[PDB]
Design an enzyme around this catalytic site. Structure first.
Site, mmCIF file in Angstrom:
data_model
loop_
_atom_site.group_PDB
_atom_site.id
_atom_site.type_symbol
_atom_site.label_atom_id
_atom_site.label_comp_id
_atom_site.label_asym_id
_atom_site.label_seq_id
_atom_site.Cartn_x
_atom_site.Cartn_y
_atom_site.Cartn_z
ATOM 1 N N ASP A 115 14.975 -3.607 11.614
ATOM 2 C CA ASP A 115 15.324 -2.186 11.570
ATOM 3 C C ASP A 115 16.737 -2.036 12.135
ATOM 4 O O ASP A 115 16.936 -2.089 13.354
ATOM 5 C CB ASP A 115 14.312 -1.347 12.361
ATOM 6 C CG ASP A 115 14.600 0.156 12.294
ATOM 7 O OD1 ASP A 115 15.774 0.565 12.139
ATOM 8 O OD2 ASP A 115 13.635 0.939 12.404
ATOM 9 N N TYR A 133 3.352 8.073 1.067
ATOM 10 C CA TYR A 133 4.107 6.815 1.031
ATOM 11 C C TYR A 133 4.462 6.332 -0.375
ATOM 12 O O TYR A 133 5.229 5.375 -0.528
ATOM 13 C CB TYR A 133 3.409 5.723 1.853
ATOM 14 C CG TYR A 133 3.637 5.854 3.347
ATOM 15 C CD1 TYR A 133 3.075 6.912 4.065
ATOM 16 C CD2 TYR A 133 4.423 4.938 4.037
ATOM 17 C CE1 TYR A 133 3.288 7.043 5.427
ATOM 18 C CE2 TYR A 133 4.638 5.059 5.406
ATOM 19 C CZ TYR A 133 4.069 6.114 6.094
ATOM 20 O OH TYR A 133 4.274 6.251 7.449
ATOM 21 N N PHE A 184 0.833 -1.202 0.000
ATOM 22 C CA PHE A 184 0.000 0.000 0.000
ATOM 23 C C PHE A 184 0.864 1.248 0.000
ATOM 24 O O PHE A 184 1.781 1.391 0.810
ATOM 25 C CB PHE A 184 -0.950 -0.012 1.204
ATOM 26 C CG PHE A 184 -2.062 -1.020 1.076
ATOM 27 C CD1 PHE A 184 -1.804 -2.388 1.177
ATOM 28 C CD2 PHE A 184 -3.367 -0.610 0.841
ATOM 29 C CE1 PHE A 184 -2.825 -3.321 1.047
ATOM 30 C CE2 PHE A 184 -4.392 -1.542 0.706
ATOM 31 C CZ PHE A 184 -4.122 -2.899 0.805
ATOM 32 N N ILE A 224 -0.123 4.945 0.012
ATOM 33 C CA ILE A 224 -1.195 5.923 0.118
ATOM 34 C C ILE A 224 -0.590 7.255 0.540
ATOM 35 O O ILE A 224 0.289 7.300 1.402
ATOM 36 C CB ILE A 224 -2.278 5.451 1.130
ATOM 37 C CG1 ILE A 224 -2.876 4.095 0.719
ATOM 38 C CG2 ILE A 224 -3.370 6.500 1.327
ATOM 39 C CD1 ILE A 224 -3.591 4.074 -0.615
ATOM 40 N N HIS A 230 8.176 -10.160 15.160
ATOM 41 C CA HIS A 230 8.440 -8.717 15.245
ATOM 42 C C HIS A 230 9.865 -8.506 15.788
ATOM 43 O O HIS A 230 10.258 -9.152 16.777
ATOM 44 C CB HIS A 230 7.409 -8.088 16.183
ATOM 45 C CG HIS A 230 7.357 -6.591 16.152
ATOM 46 N ND1 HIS A 230 8.393 -5.793 16.588
ATOM 47 C CD2 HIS A 230 6.349 -5.748 15.817
ATOM 48 C CE1 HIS A 230 8.042 -4.523 16.486
ATOM 49 N NE2 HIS A 230 6.803 -4.469 16.025
ATOM 50 N N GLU A 243 -2.216 -4.752 13.523
ATOM 51 C CA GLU A 243 -1.250 -5.689 14.113
ATOM 52 C C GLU A 243 -1.809 -6.391 15.354
ATOM 53 O O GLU A 243 -1.527 -7.572 15.586
ATOM 54 C CB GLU A 243 0.060 -4.976 14.434
ATOM 55 C CG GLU A 243 1.126 -5.815 15.131
ATOM 56 C CD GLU A 243 2.410 -5.028 15.266
ATOM 57 O OE1 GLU A 243 2.580 -4.339 16.299
ATOM 58 O OE2 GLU A 243 3.222 -5.052 14.318
ATOM 59 N N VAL A 282 5.363 -0.788 2.889
ATOM 60 C CA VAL A 282 6.097 -0.214 1.747
ATOM 61 C C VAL A 282 7.392 0.523 2.127
ATOM 62 O O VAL A 282 8.310 0.638 1.297
ATOM 63 C CB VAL A 282 5.185 0.720 0.899
ATOM 64 C CG1 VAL A 282 4.966 2.072 1.579
ATOM 65 C CG2 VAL A 282 5.751 0.900 -0.512
ATOM 66 N N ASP A 283 7.476 1.013 3.364
ATOM 67 C CA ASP A 283 8.619 1.837 3.781
ATOM 68 C C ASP A 283 9.789 0.966 4.229
ATOM 69 O O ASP A 283 10.308 1.086 5.346
ATOM 70 C CB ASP A 283 8.210 2.880 4.835
ATOM 71 C CG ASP A 283 7.493 2.280 6.046
ATOM 72 O OD1 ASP A 283 6.979 1.148 5.991
ATOM 73 O OD2 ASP A 283 7.429 2.979 7.077
HETATM 74 C C1 BHE Z 1 11.991 -4.927 24.093
HETATM 75 C C2 BHE Z 1 12.199 -3.419 24.231
HETATM 76 C C3 BHE Z 1 11.054 -2.677 23.540
HETATM 77 C C4 BHE Z 1 11.596 -1.888 22.337
HETATM 78 C C5 BHE Z 1 10.747 -2.188 21.090
HETATM 79 C C6 BHE Z 1 11.269 -1.384 19.895
HETATM 80 C C7 BHE Z 1 10.488 -1.727 18.616
HETATM 81 C C8 BHE Z 1 9.177 -0.935 18.521
HETATM 82 O O1 BHE Z 1 8.581 -1.159 17.231
HETATM 83 C C9 BHE Z 1 7.208 -0.793 17.211
HETATM 84 O O2 BHE Z 1 6.444 -1.804 17.910
HETATM 85 C C10 BHE Z 1 5.031 -1.496 17.943
HETATM 86 C C11 BHE Z 1 4.348 -2.586 18.783
HETATM 87 O O3 BHE Z 1 4.795 -2.461 20.142
HETATM 88 C C12 BHE Z 1 4.454 -1.430 16.519
HETATM 89 O O4 BHE Z 1 4.639 -2.685 15.821
HETATM 90 C C13 BHE Z 1 5.208 -0.350 15.754
HETATM 91 O O5 BHE Z 1 4.741 -0.308 14.401
HETATM 92 C C14 BHE Z 1 6.718 -0.661 15.762
HETATM 93 O O6 BHE Z 1 7.424 0.411 15.133
HETATM 94 C C15 BHE Z 1 7.834 0.116 13.778
HETATM 95 O O7 BHE Z 1 8.866 -0.897 13.744
HETATM 96 C C16 BHE Z 1 10.095 -0.515 14.413
HETATM 97 C C17 BHE Z 1 11.078 -1.688 14.337
HETATM 98 C C18 BHE Z 1 10.670 0.767 13.781
HETATM 99 O O8 BHE Z 1 11.042 0.541 12.407
HETATM 100 C C19 BHE Z 1 9.610 1.871 13.834
HETATM 101 O O9 BHE Z 1 10.108 3.059 13.219
HETATM 102 C C20 BHE Z 1 8.329 1.405 13.124
HETATM 103 O O10 BHE Z 1 7.306 2.401 13.234
HETATM 104 MN MN MN Z 2 6.581 2.058 8.883
#
Ligand code: BHE
Ligand code: MN
Ligand code: WS1
Ligand code: WS1
Ligand code: BHE
Ligand code: MN
EC number: 2.4.1.40
Lengths: 289, 289
Positions: free
Chosen positions: B269, B69, B64, B66, B176, B246, B155-156
């Protein structure tokens, strides 16, 4: 049923899986084609029982008791009652030349037994090999309408521990207890290029035991038909594979990878091989002579 | 095609699997319901490529783009060309409110791209959540007739290493990257019983990322429809789940176990989390801001 709309699992309380802890540190638990290798410690039976019960799974178990081998049926069936797929629908199929020699074994609820009369071959090799033709024939006659999965085993065995839905998958073979630690060059595959079961010295994943294989009815039909047709070609060419049906089973599973592989917990001989540290349970074992 | 008669594999020369050597000593490589957890070292890609090519597998990839993005599409698509399912049939589906902003990316043979115009929602939360409705709708319109498997991603991101047929299975989620080593109590599941996404403190296997999931078209249709319907119930009850789509994905995968789980190699990341020893490859990574 297989592959039909699945309802949600209920709330369950169990230990969290540990991403950063291997479930076994001493054995391979997944094949290179991403099929689980089933060892104790790899599975939570409560989760698996839920998944398969919600699909109302019926498991067929085939066994051949030809000539003197009828003597093994009583122990085989009584121990199966204690250990095989308890809680699920089971249909035993006993192939025999002596319907009157089948013992009257008491069965738990949801479990049934059918006696299928077949001809007896003179050579023990032919009795063993012709199981492929007979299983394939009955896949068409009964099995497609009566069971979801088929498990095909030797009769001169007994169950000593849990054998359950953890084994169920479209196609499975079992690691032969004599060779699980052997290099492929040492495997007793058929080595003559003149045979349909031929496997070269530089090929092979595992040595699977002819005594324990299975899968969905569709996949078992395919395997047994293919092995029977290959044996017939060999017969026409005046060659008999070194380990008979087991040689052909090994060729088939090399070319058509199983979707699960069972560890030697599921096929063992304690008299010959003892009880190694890698086996946390001995589930299905040879009857000593 | 999926689940159709499979021809034999050709003769292949590769290292023998080692029964008495774990493929990883530092991570869990199979779930307690016997789903592989996909890490480097668990799979032979040559065997898997053979299996999937012989079935003439087509993989759909949904993304996506949108509003702002759309800026991420060029890098996403160019890196997908280098790393995603190379050698197999691929169909990209780009959902966008700006068809004219889709970059002209050069595609390899057997690979195609369709632009699907959709409406833009005002809130980033709704844009994200409404992906479930849109994916489900198109499962019926295009996907069932055009692809065998669907892969649904953010997409990012950019591909930096191989993402191939090792991921394909009826239903998969991805660990995750923020939480793969966390205990279940620390997972950021929805914790309010008033929401359809509610998971109690004593339940949960893994925290799956909303940014990377997929499966067969049938299973993706089921997942996306279920998540959409759950979100609609929540909306009617005046509640929005803590992590939106999610949170619902996590509830669904708790109750309907995935048949493979992807390691964080597949969703990473590097800016935020570096490059830990447990990751031998970084395959699909966040674009830094
Ligand atoms: C163990 C210590 C705790 C530290 C945890 C650090 C990772 C946090 O991650 C976020 O987690 C959220 C759920 O709780 C959502 O999935 C969010 O989209 C995500 O951020 C995304 O993914 C991330 C990896 C980054 O890329 C961020 O910029 C994104 O928005
Ligand atoms: Mn993102
Ligand atoms: O197990 C053997 N044969 C494979 C199966 O083939 C079936 N069989 C074999 C010969 C036979 O006469 N009757 C019979 O029913 C039984 O189900 C056997 O379990 C076998 C053959 C020769 C020697 C031994 C020693 O163990 N086993
Ligand atoms: O990735 C995010 N949202 C999930 C996906 O939802 C889609 N999206 C989200 C908001 C949006 O305005 N446009 C859009 O296309 C993109 O495909 C995103 O990858 C997101 C949202 C807010 C902040 C960040 C930072 O990273 N990411
Ligand atoms: C590594 C050192 C090499 C030593 C290997 C020792 C195991 C030999 O195993 C035999 O293997 C054959 C194939 O090569 C056939 O499968 C045969 O049926 C089987 O004997 C069967 O299974 C056995 C376990 C015993 O129960 C035996 O009585 C059976 O007839
Ligand atoms: Mn025997």
């Amino acid at each position: 049923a297989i592959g039909e709309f699945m309802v949600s699992l209920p709330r369950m309380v169990y230990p969290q899986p540990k991403v950063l802890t291997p479930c076994r540190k001493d054995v391979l638990v997944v094949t290179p084609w991403l099929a689980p290798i089933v060892w104790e410690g790899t599975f939570n039976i409560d989760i698996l029982n839920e998944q398969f019960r919600l699909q109302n799974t019926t498991i067929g178990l085939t066994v051949f008791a030809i000539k003197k081998y009828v003597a093994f049926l009583k122990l085989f069936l009584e121990t199966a009652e204690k250990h095989f797929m308890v809680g699920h629908r089971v249909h035993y199929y006993v192939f025999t030349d002596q319907p009157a020699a089948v013992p009257r074994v008491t069965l738990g609820t949801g479990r049934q037994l059918s006696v299928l009369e077949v001809r007896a071959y003179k050579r023990w090799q032919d009795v063993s090999m012709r199981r492929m033709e007979m299983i394939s024939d009955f896949c068409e006659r009964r099995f497609l309408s009566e069971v979801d999965y088929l498990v095909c085993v030797d009769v001169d065995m007994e169950f000593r521990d849990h054998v359950g839905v953890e084994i169920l998958t479209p196609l499975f073979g079992t690691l032969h207890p004599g060779f699980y630690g052997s290099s492929r060059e040492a495997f007793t595959y058929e080595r003559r290029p003149q045979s349909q079961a031929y496997i070269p010295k530089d090929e092979g994943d595992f040595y699977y035991g002819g005594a324990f294989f299975g899968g969905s009815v569709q996949e078992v039909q395919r395997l047994t038909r293919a092995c029977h047709q290959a044996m017939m070609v060999d017969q026409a060419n005046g060659i008999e594979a070194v380990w008979h049906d087991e040689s052909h089973l090994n060729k088939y599973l090399l070319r058509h990878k199983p979707t699960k592989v069972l560890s030697p917990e599921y096929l063992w001989d304690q008299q010959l091989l003892g009880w190694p540290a890698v086996l946390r349970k001995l589930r299905f074992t040879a009857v000593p002579k």
